[PDB]
Design a protein around this nucleic acid. Structure first.
Ligand SMILES: [Mg+2]
Ligand SMILES: [Mg+2]
Ligand SMILES: [Zn+2]
Length: 406
DNA sequence: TCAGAAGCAGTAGAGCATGCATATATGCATGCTCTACTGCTTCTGACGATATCG
DNA sequence: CGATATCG
């Protein structure tokens, strides 16, 4: 999910990954990647009506994001309003107002996120300092020190705020394995399965639309088989991905999707209508790459687990784990840090108190001096009546006199 | 006698929300409201012929 | 034929 309101505190004139209610007054739109939770309001009728009444508002995103977005027929009205920006290329954006001729320049830099085709970061630099928006990123430990654009002369830049992805910001997802390990496990399993007979097929229950192209491409390169998907016209301008997918159902590896694909697999049938070739039945096994299932285990588990006679689960996460998030935020050391999404189990307060010790808040101060005036006793209640005998005791000490005047 | 006027019920067309599981992406499906418009049913009253009285 | 009151 995306708990972001698509509006930074430093630059409220730009909205990122959210165009629902208050972002209709923004001067520039930014899109991290092409996931549905980061595209709320992008197809709204009010936004459609606003686009046809303005000329200076644009939608900035990665070129791969533009290719994936313009392929959908529902978003083709953005064809003349999308401006793609290369990664690691500092460009100047003009936040010109429509009504008044006022203008404001800001410098944005796109950084790779390693999440899905077209996923990038947004690094803004303007009058209110430097802010960073890492929407659904994935960085291993020790990789934050390798980003060239986040360093200024060998040291980390002065970052004011970080709107980081906190999908797995909880002690349950302590150290998620790298995607290479899950890839190797899935490759070994699929090889050992399909190497027996040409009728052994492997399903890949991939929930997200984008993010699993790495697995498909590497399985195709290591097995020579082409994965089956529903639609592949979206990758028509991406040769390195298009030549690994196929619409034909006569392939072994499959990654097709369907709302009722579970019952179909239970009936020994892929999501595609084909259930057998040449009237010879097919032997199907299901591999579901996910991460939330592994975050609920109670003992030592493996990357490739077997939950049934023809069912498997793989730990394939496109989100940074708790340790990776902590390492990234501690290396950046920003003034503030806001969670974009709250975990299902965790709440807002726990994520906030986890992220706070990592922020650059190393500034303490002694409490303000509370004055003490007008003492709480006016009259001397401890006064004596001065009745004595004056003979049992020695003479009183005479009052001293001091005439020195410096 | 009957034209015309209320009064009420149904729908098109747009728009929006939520429910979906151990997924953080679902997009996808589904089901609801709103508003203007049309049609049917019930009601009313003026009206003209024609009955009746002079 | 008046023209008044029905009655549909
Ligand atoms: Mg997303
Ligand atoms: Mg994402
Ligand atoms: Zn298929």
């Amino acid at each position: 999910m995306s708990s972001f309101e698509g509006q930074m505190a430093e630059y409220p004139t730009i909205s990122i990954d959210r165009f629902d209610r208050e972002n209709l007054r923004a001067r520039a739109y930014f899109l991290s990647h092409c996931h549905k939770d980061h595209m709320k309001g992008l197809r709204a009728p009010t936004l459609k009506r606003r686009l046809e009444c303005s000329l200076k508002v644009y939608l900035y995103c990665s070129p791969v994001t533009k290719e994936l977005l313009l392929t959908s027929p529902k978003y083709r009205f953005w064809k003349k309003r999308i401006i793609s920006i290369e990664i690691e290329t500092p460009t100047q954006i003009s936040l010109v107002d429509e009504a008044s001729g006022e203008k404001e320049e800001i410098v944005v830099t796109l950084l790779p996120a390693g999440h899905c085709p077209g996923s990038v970061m947004f690094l803004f630099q303007g009058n209110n300092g430097t802010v960073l928006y890492t929407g659904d990123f994935r960085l291993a430990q020790g990789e934050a020190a390798r980003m060239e654009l986040l360093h200024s002369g060998g040291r980390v830049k002065d970052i004011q705020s970080v709107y980081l992805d906190t999908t797995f910001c909880d002690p349950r997802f302590y150290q998620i394995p790298s995607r290479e390990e899950c890839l190797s496990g899935v490759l070994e399993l699929v090889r050992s399965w399909i190497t027996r007979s040409p009728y052994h097929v492997v399903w890949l229950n991939c929930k997200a639309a984008y993010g699993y192209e790495y697995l498909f491409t590497n399985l195709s390169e290591e097995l020579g088989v082409q994965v089956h998907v529903n639609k592949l016209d979206m990758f028509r301008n991406m040769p390195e991905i298009l030549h690994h997918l196929t619409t034909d159902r006569n392939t072994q590896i499959h990654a097709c999707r369907h709302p009722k694909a579970e019952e179909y697999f239970q009936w020994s049938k892929l999501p595609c209508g084909i259930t057998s070739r040449n009237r010879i039945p097919l032997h199907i096994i299901s591999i579901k790459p996910s991460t939330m299932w592994f975050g609920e285990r109670s003992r030592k588990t493996n990357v490739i687990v077997r939950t049934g006679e023809s069912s498997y689960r793989a730990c394939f996460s496109f989100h940074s784990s708790y340790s990776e998030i902590k390492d990234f935020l501690s290396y950046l050391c920003p003034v503030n840090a806001y969670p974009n999404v709250i975990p299902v189990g965790t709440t807002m307060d726990k994520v906030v108190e986890i992220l706070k010790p990592l922020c650059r808040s190393s500034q303490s101060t002694e409490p303000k001096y509370k004055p003490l005036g007008k003492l709480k006793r006016a009259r001397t209640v401890h006064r004596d009546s001065e009745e004595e005998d004056d003979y049992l005791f020695d003479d009183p000490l005479p009052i001293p006199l001091r005439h020195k005047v410096p």
